[PDB]
Design a protein around this ligand. Structure first.
Ligand SMILES: N[C@@H](CCCC[B-](O)(O)O)C(=O)O
Ligand SMILES: N[C@@H](CCCC[B-](O)(O)O)C(=O)O
Ligand SMILES: N[C@@H](CCCC[B-](O)(O)O)C(=O)O
Ligand SMILES: [Mn+2]
Ligand SMILES: [Mn+2]
Ligand SMILES: [Mn+2]
Ligand SMILES: [Mn+2]
Ligand SMILES: [Mn+2]
Ligand SMILES: [Mn+2]
Lengths: 314, 314, 314
């Protein structure tokens, strides 16, 4: 089977807007665990992590709330490593994308051979020195990459981090708002990506074929899908902090996640950047949450062609 | 030429909402016959069928309004067989999709070799025993399939039905809300389908190439297109009873119907499930009707690249 | 480098609605020149052309405002030829599409070997005798084509025109509302086109590969892109005079223009038919202008994957 361990991560200090803290609540209120159970799934809820307040947390140079973000990911890393030890797929409900530092680190403690698929409008690979916003949700990949060891200063809250993935172990899908220093890093390190230009050229079918052949061609290994809902067009996921037009369609989102399910190798999942307070109407909220739920159920086997139990229904 | 015989089928008892009865009226009011005439076409209006009320029509087990639905399709079968005998393409304006039992049966009385293309979010292949809703618009394909003879109980109103197509003679396009028993039937009988996952993988161009090669590869034969407007995304066809997100685009709808026109083998057409009373605004209504008209004109030769008469326009 | 010369062409008499005169103003107010400068670009503003009023300009047969439209294009031709002589890419901000008569003519005075890519819902190839509207924005290609010399009467205001491109030197992309005489001309002269049916069949990636191989396969030559914002779906560009559903997506627009940038051969650009007074809300206006700006920045190197200077950002 495909057993799941849910971790709520109601955390926002990777970016300015507090409302991403409500992500785990609204996803749960939408029926996510029940819907997973209705499907094939063995679901264990590990609850919502209690992130304690750090009142003294002044910027490190440009970088904001560093101790809060570092501690939150340190905590999340421990929890993810626990559910992996318990032989379940970690499903992290965010919260802002800085949490991927903890989610991927904890996962790699148990499965050092993982490969990452990063669905996002953004590369999230600024370093604490290339960042212009100082927002740690725009930096998580730089903390994770072994090649960028030497380029990450000693940021308070992160001394526990050990880079765990190499540039050859991640694929981006959905890119359309990449900062110049980020583009430099991508080209310098030879990281594999499918920007929206590539999705337009190739179609999502060939994008997935190529993604999965690149990560799993040599040998089967665990897959970590880090899904920023702003990877999808804001006509599907408007209640998010950094929307960018010309995104992946609803259909393309489901296709990506259906194909990853079918590898049988999904090992960790992040559903990040849902911020209900940013919808301009209550329907923009429902739209966003419903889409996030649909993407999540596809990761665990819900197929558009249909599903049945191995019984004779006639 | 390509002569057409219009049949209005203002019938709703295959499902709960009465407003699909207005389908033939609003399609006609939108200028459909005049627009067909403006095009290449020889159009004969056979009028709207008068469906008489059946006051005593209690459910058969789960199954609702069985005698009303059976009689309506029996009537429609006769009428379609008439216009086929008169050497015209039957164009059935619905009405709910239970009418396809009559439309395809009547057609097959004259052209037993037909092939069916079924454009829908749904497979409509529940049997009277697998159905959970008891709504006959979700069952028509099971009454038509020769393989499912033995699995259809003797439902009052349907003793006149003789299954007329085999599992190898239908192709589905657009599927995204298939019940478990339906998915079992699809896999058991080896029915050809292009769910939205397949349309995403392949593109609509390859979907059509493959559809038409599957049905017409061995030999040319008449094609019956049964078109449920909920096959298209509800952003194009919102005024319908069972909308499902992530549908075929307007463009994909026109492409399907342009390609079928170009085979020269269109023999019967169903335009089903238009329900103006379900639009939330008068523009949702116009949107839905206009899209249904556009799909219909493409079936009879309107091409996006343009059209001209065999005259010298210079 | 890729130096640009901006020409504002605030002209509307090719069609009935005056508000396309505001196109150059709103594009400039949206930050277009500054955004180009932020990118790689060497931008020289040649200002807005002053089109003088012609009070005595009665129709020529069907054809409206002929002397106004002819004079405006004569003026624009001179200006475009100037900026080409100055070794810059002419960027014409319209204004209605009748201006392409001047823009392409002026360009060809300096680069007689150019090839044209015409992005539009419409072919704009009516002659003064096949037109039914008499609106010159629907006629510019017929004045430009050497093969249609003999079929263009002597229209007042156009005696200065010399047809400068052959039928083999233009490719259309986006067609979906082509008049019968226009379709006759397309088929008679064997003009290359990708209607929306072809874009649906092939995908925009293969459309661009085929466009560019057709125009540049034999030898490199300058490219003139004439971009009517109604080529894009009205969900992206609603503030325009002749919207047509089922258009190119935002993504497809950016892909077309990214691919043309990458040839290194863009030589002239037209951004036509933006009419802010036709948006039904202030957001429809911003939507339309923002999309036109995005298409324009892609023509000059803005890439969705990102951009960086040849510096070490680490
Ligand atoms: N590159 C910008 C945007 C980051 C957006 C972060 B994300 O993808 O997690 O939403 C920044 O560094 O601040
Ligand atoms: N499978 C559901 C939905 C049927 C919808 C029917 B249709 O496709 O014609 O709109 C049911 O059996 O009730
Ligand atoms: N074919 C119609 C429509 C022309 C629309 C012009 B255009 O593409 O520049 O917006 C006419 O001749 O009037
Ligand atoms: Mn993002
Ligand atoms: Mn992100
Ligand atoms: Mn349906
Ligand atoms: Mn149906
Ligand atoms: Mn146009
Ligand atoms: Mn035009």
């Amino acid at each position: 089977s495909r057993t799941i361990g849910i971790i709520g991560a109601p955390f926002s200090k990777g970016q300015p807007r507090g409302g991403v803290e409500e992500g785990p609540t609204v996803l749960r209120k939408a029926g996510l665990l029940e819907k997973l159970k209705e499907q094939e799934c063995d679901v264990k809820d590990y609850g919502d992590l209690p992130f304690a307040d750090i009142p003294n947390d002044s910027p490190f140079q440009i970088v904001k709330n560093p101790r809060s973000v570092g501690k939150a990911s340190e905590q999340l890393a421990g929890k993810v490593a626990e559910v992996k030890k318990n032989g379940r797929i970690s499903l992290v409900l965010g919260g802002d994308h800085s949490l991927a530092i903890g989610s991927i680190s904890g996962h790699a403690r148990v499965h050092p051979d993982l490969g990452v698929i990063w669905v996002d409008a953004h590369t999230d690979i600024n370093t604490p020195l290339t960042t212009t916003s100082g927002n740690l949700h725009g930096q998580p990949v730089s903390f994770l990459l072994k090649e960028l060891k030497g380029k990450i200063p000693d940021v308070p809250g992160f001394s526990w981090v050990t880079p765990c993935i190499s540039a050859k172990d991640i694929v981006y899908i959905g890119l359309r708002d990449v900062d110049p220093g980020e583009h430099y890093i991508l080209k310098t390190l030879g990281i594999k990506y499918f920007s929206m230009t590539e999705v337009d050229r190739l179609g999502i079918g060939k994008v997935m074929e190529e993604t999965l052949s690149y990560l799993l061609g040599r040998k089967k290994r665990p897959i970590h899908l880090s899904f920023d809902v702003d990877g999808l067009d804001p006509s599907f996921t408007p209640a998010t902090g950094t929307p960018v037009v010309g995104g992946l369609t609803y259909r393309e989102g489901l296709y990506i996640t259906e194909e990853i399910y079918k590898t049988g190798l999904l090992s960790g999942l992040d559903i990040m950047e849902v911020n209900p307070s940013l919808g301009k109407t209550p329907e923009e909220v429902t739209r966003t949450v419903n889409t996030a739920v649909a993407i999540t159920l596809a990761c665990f086997g819900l197929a558009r062609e249909g599903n049945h139990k191995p019984i004779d229904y006639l």
